Amino acid sequence: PKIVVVGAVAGGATCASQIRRLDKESDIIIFEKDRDMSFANCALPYVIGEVVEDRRYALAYTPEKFYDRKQITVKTYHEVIAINDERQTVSVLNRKTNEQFEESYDKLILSPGASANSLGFESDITFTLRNLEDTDAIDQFIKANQVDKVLVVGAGYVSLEVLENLYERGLHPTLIHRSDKINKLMDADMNQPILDELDKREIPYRLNEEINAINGNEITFKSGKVEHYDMIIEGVGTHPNSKFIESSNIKLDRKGFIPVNDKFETNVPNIYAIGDIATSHYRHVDLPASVPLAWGAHRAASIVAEQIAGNDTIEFKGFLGNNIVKFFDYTFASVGVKPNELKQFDYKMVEVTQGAHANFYPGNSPLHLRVYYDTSNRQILRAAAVGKEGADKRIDVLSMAMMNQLTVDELTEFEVAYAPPYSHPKDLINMIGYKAK
Amino acid sequence: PKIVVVGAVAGGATCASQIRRLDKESDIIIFEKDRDMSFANCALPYVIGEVVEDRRYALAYTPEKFYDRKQITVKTYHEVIAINDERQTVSVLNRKTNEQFEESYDKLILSPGASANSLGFESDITFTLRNLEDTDAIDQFIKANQVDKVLVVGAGYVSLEVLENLYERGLHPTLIHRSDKINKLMDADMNQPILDELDKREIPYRLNEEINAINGNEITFKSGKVEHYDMIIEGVGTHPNSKFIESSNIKLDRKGFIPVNDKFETNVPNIYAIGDIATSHYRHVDLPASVPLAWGAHRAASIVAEQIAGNDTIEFKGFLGNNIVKFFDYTFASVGVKPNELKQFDYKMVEVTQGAHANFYPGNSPLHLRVYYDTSNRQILRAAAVGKEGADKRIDVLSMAMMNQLTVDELTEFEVAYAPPYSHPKDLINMIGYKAK
Numbered sequence A, B: 001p002k003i004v005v006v007g008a009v010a011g012g013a014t015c016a017s018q019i020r021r022l023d024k025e026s027d028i029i030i031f032e033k034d035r036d037m038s039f040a041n042c043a044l045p046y047v048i049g050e051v052v053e054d055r056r057y058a059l060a061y062t063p064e065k066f067y068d069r070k071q072i073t074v075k076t077y078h079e080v081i082a083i084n085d086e087r088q089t090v091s092v093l094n095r096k097t098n099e100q101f102e103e104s105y106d107k108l109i110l111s112p113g114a115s116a117n118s119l120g121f122e123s124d125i126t127f128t129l130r131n132l133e134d135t136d137a138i139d140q141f142i143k144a145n146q147v148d149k150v151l152v153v154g155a156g157y158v159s160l161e162v163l164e165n166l167y168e169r170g171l172h173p174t175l176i177h178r179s180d181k182i183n184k185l186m187d188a189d190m191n192q193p194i195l196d197e198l199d200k201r202e203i204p205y206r207l208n209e210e211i212n213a214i215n216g217n218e219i220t221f222k223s224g225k226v227e228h229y230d231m232i233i234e235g236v237g238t239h240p241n242s243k244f245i246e247s248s249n250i251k252l253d254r255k256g257f258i259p260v261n262d263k264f265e266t267n268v269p270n271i272y273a274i275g276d277i278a279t280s281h282y283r284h285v286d287l288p289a290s291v292p293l294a295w296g297a298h299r300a301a302s303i304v305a306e307q308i309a310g311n312d313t314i315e316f317k318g319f320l321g322n323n324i325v326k327f328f329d330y331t332f333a334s335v336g337v338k339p340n341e342l343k344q345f346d347y348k349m350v351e352v353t354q355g356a357h358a359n360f361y362p363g364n365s366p367l368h369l370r371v372y373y374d375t376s377n378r379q380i381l382r383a384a385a386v387g388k389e390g391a392d393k394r395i396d397v398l399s400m401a402m403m404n405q406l407t408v409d410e411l412t413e414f415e416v417a418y419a420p421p422y423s424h425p426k427d428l429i430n431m432i433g434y435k436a437k
């Protein structure tokens, strides 16, 4: 079939590539509104930090290389401005020429993702971070202005990664956030090490703080404080790129996301939606779920490829919401329903804090593991782990447990790989099971 | 009930402790033939390497402390020399006085573990490593003789740990092993980095090599080579501590181990056996299993405690055989049936070699992950991972999958925790799944 894809990055380019793996005949075209396809979204903060300096790590392909290798046509600087689902075309704006045209499709795959929110100030020194265009512009602004002091706004994983990278680059960031609710995917009382790592490095932060006014480099804050900054990076949330979808027959929720079934089909025949734009359900509980992360974009890309050109019995089984961030020496990982969603269950919490590996063994660091379970059936609802070492391991194991409908009690049966550098004979995971009841 | 435990370490002291958690009234006595209870078996190589300096790390308890904290009586230098099972007593030799006596029991728990094998040479420079007495003697001998050149016999994981520790202490070890099957719980082709790490450090080794004769410090080998060594550590296997059991009604297998049911009961009422002495079965396949490792000792200890003083419906579900060792920069982990046991199944093998984490993120290294599955039912039979980073995480996840008899195909659904320092959007685990079709 003739396949059109909207968005040429984590969901879209991946999906198109996966289809080509299965189907060498179909015409495939991707429209991307910005300059680059296949940029490495998750690498961006590290590019800014000069931790990642090879351009080849910043983006996988140009349209020319992608066509040469895969015979997939990608048109950059082409923005889809409407979906004409009844006539099975999309309307596309060529942004170089400022002329629009219709492109027909047999199958349409929407992976437009989200855009960064902006505070709205009229400021030449303020930047958001979403793509490689943004990344290049930030790097260039730092160099042209000999930037030293940077204000980082917001305390989600993106902002936190950007802050760390600015620091490692040798700049001097200050972090502010409008509330004390930092790193919101993690249990609020488990985020202290973020603040400790800031303090340890004498990196200033202010919570319950906001930009009030900007006058050149002079920033006035809600607290009443007045400071001078060379640059500002705003990480104040994102919004779904769905405005171009609203006039079509595609069902959107009230927040502008696209609900999909387990084949990533929208309500409209022959139109799929994947990536950050799509909403689904949890795998382990009967609740809606939105998990705007890379795993989901990639998993959906594969499922859609099977749906269109492969085994159409392959369907999504729902999200677990596994997520993770590094901040200096610490790892913050969690899986399952969000803190705010726990209230829909009768639940209990169990926790253990123990060395990631043998107590007698050097280089040890306390790992805090917390598990929430449903009192009605003992099923695991959510897990969270924070520590310098071993948090990723414990959370991935618990992700696999939740995939298999394990009860908290059965965690005593988990057979850990034990030697002194790695764990304990009764691992933190086993201890959760013992401590449950 | 009156409880007697034989052996005061990984299985025995643990089980006694777990019973006390549930039962504060029963009299519990443990007999231990050697000097120390609750020594840290797994720390011993690292004590030798002076990685563990604080000997306090090598000994968790003294009998006096155990009685003060847990009201459990532990008699060291007390060797159980017979089990009089029909009268429900054990005969105990007080090694300090060489006088024996009977101790009555309502329940008897056997955790005597295993002893080091010896090559049997008449040599004052040869040592084995099984307890803290041995570690003390080795440490003392190194100092007293200013040991430099040390011959390490045996290539099992503990000998490898001892070798690394001797090297890091500043000594010059040579490794020999009677065959080429080093680190035998791992796939033979995947053990190459052991030899690479030896080579990189110019640590000599010879496989299919054996001691022929010992003449003071002059060692003559099967190969005909003659070398002088200051010390020899023999790691040539272990044997079950069951000689004191042979006169009783307890059934032993032809190798001197004790087959137990899922309640860790022997064939004799009121007698349990746990730890290295006990044999069981696999959880995921119908085959016998012996897994002489710490996790199994600890798990059986809790199950016996529940049987005796807690919830007696709690039973063992069998072993998976999860195991791991660090050797210099590399980790070697496997789980499931042993290499030689694969031939009892119709199976296929899937493998990937990919970066432990995002390719663009610094400090990356190749992680080799291999999965064997049963062709009759797609179930995972065995998995093995080797790499500088991430092998423990992948194998623990696969242990949790196998615990649930998950299929190789379902690995595509595993929801990994992804950020650049940790994994990939399609993790190695997912790739096994995608590559299994």
Ligand SMILES: Cc1cc2nc3c(=O)[nH]c(=O)nc-3n(C[C@H](O)[C@H](O)[C@H](O)COP(=O)(O)OP(=O)(O)OC[C@H]3O[C@@H](n4cnc5c(N)ncnc54)[C@H](O)[C@@H]3O)c2cc1C
Pocket (backbone or CB within 6 Å): A006, A007, A008, A009, A010, A011, A012, A031, A032, A033, A034, A041, A042, A043, A044, A045, A078, A079, A080, A081, A111, A112, A113, A114, A129, A130, A131, A158, A241, A244, A274, A275, A276, A277, A292, A293, A294, A295, A297, B418, B419, B420
């Ligand atoms: C700085 C940063 C760091 C991140 N780190 C992590 C991480 O460590 N772990 C993790 O799991 N996730 C991380 N993410 C999240 C991640 O990248 C997303 O979940 C993923 O990119 C979603 O894929 P997508 O296809 O939905 O959106 P994208 O990959 O953002 O691609 C969407 C594309 O569609 C284009 N588009 C939108 N509308 C139109 C239109 N009307 N016409 C044509 N093109 C259009 C956009 O320009 C865009 O290029 C990070 C994101 C950022 C910005």
Ligand SMILES: Cc1cc2nc3c(=O)[nH]c(=O)nc-3n(C[C@H](O)[C@H](O)[C@H](O)COP(=O)(O)OP(=O)(O)OC[C@H]3O[C@@H](n4cnc5c(N)ncnc54)[C@H](O)[C@@H]3O)c2cc1C
Pocket (backbone or CB within 6 Å): A418, A419, A420, B006, B007, B008, B009, B010, B011, B012, B031, B032, B033, B034, B041, B042, B043, B044, B045, B078, B079, B080, B081, B111, B112, B113, B114, B129, B130, B131, B158, B241, B244, B274, B275, B276, B277, B292, B293, B294, B295, B297
């Ligand atoms: C150097 C070394 C490193 C190791 N590293 C690891 C590792 O990294 N990971 C892992 O999972 N396992 C490791 N192990 C294995 C581990 O320690 C065992 O699996 C575990 O100790 C088994 O518990 P157990 O109670 O059966 O035997 P043990 O802990 O050895 O205790 C048994 C005790 O019973 C006593 N005893 C025996 N007979 C009598 C008797 N007749 N009367 C009175 N007392 C008696 C013994 O003297 C001994 O103290 C290591 C072992 C050694 C020696």
Ligand SMILES: *SCCNC(=O)CCNC(=O)[C@H](O)C(C)(C)COP(=O)(O)OP(=O)(O)OC[C@H]1O[C@@H](n2cnc3c(N)ncnc32)[C@H](O)[C@@H]1OP(=O)(O)O
Pocket (backbone or CB within 6 Å): A008, A009, A010, A011, A013, A014, A017, A018, A021, A037, A038, A039, A040, A041, A042, A043, A060, A061, A294, B425, B434, B435
């Ligand atoms: S924010 C974190 C995520 N970031 C992003 O995703 C960034 C944007 N990504 C993209 O634009 C796409 O994911 C790109 C990079 C365009 C995908 O193109 P690639 O060409 O690099 O990678 P492929 O997916 O095409 O293939 C790479 C190799 O991986 C193996 N492989 C992929 N998919 C499969 C399946 N389904 N089954 C088995 N193996 C698979 C193969 O090694 C493939 O190369 P081979 O030549 O097939 O071996």
Ligand SMILES: *SCCNC(=O)CCNC(=O)[C@H](O)C(C)(C)COP(=O)(O)OP(=O)(O)OC[C@H]1O[C@@H](n2cnc3c(N)ncnc32)[C@H](O)[C@@H]1OP(=O)(O)O
Pocket (backbone or CB within 6 Å): A425, A426, A434, A435, B008, B009, B010, B011, B013, B014, B017, B018, B021, B037, B038, B039, B040, B041, B042, B043, B060, B061, B294, B302
């Ligand atoms: S070779 C690797 C293994 N080798 C060894 O085990 C060496 C010798 N081991 C032993 O002698 C015992 O394992 C000792 C060291 C005596 C300890 O036995 P326990 O496993 O019973 O642990 P503790 O009683 O010392 O308590 C430690 C912490 O774990 C909590 N805990 C243990 N068991 C449970 C159960 N069943 N349920 C809930 N919690 C449990 C303890 O309460 C304790 O927590 P803290 O907050 O640190 O006190």
Ligand SMILES: [Cl-]
Pocket (backbone or CB within 6 Å): A039, A040, A041, A042, A043
């Ligand atoms: Cl990326």
Ligand SMILES: [Cl-]
Pocket (backbone or CB within 6 Å): A083, A084, A085, A086, A087, A088
């Ligand atoms: Cl229309």
Ligand SMILES: [Cl-]
Pocket (backbone or CB within 6 Å): A351, A352, A353, A354
């Ligand atoms: Cl704790």
Ligand SMILES: [Cl-]
Pocket (backbone or CB within 6 Å): B039, B040, B041, B042, B043
């Ligand atoms: Cl230990």
Ligand SMILES: [Cl-]
Pocket (backbone or CB within 6 Å): B083, B084, B085, B086, B087, B088
């Ligand atoms: Cl008798």
Ligand SMILES: [Cl-]
Pocket (backbone or CB within 6 Å): B259, B260, B261, B265, B266, B267
């Ligand atoms: Cl039996």
Ligand SMILES: [Mg+2]
Pocket (backbone or CB within 6 Å): A084
């Ligand atoms: Mg219209």
Ligand SMILES: [Mg+2]
Pocket (backbone or CB within 6 Å): A353, A354
């Ligand atoms: Mg503690």
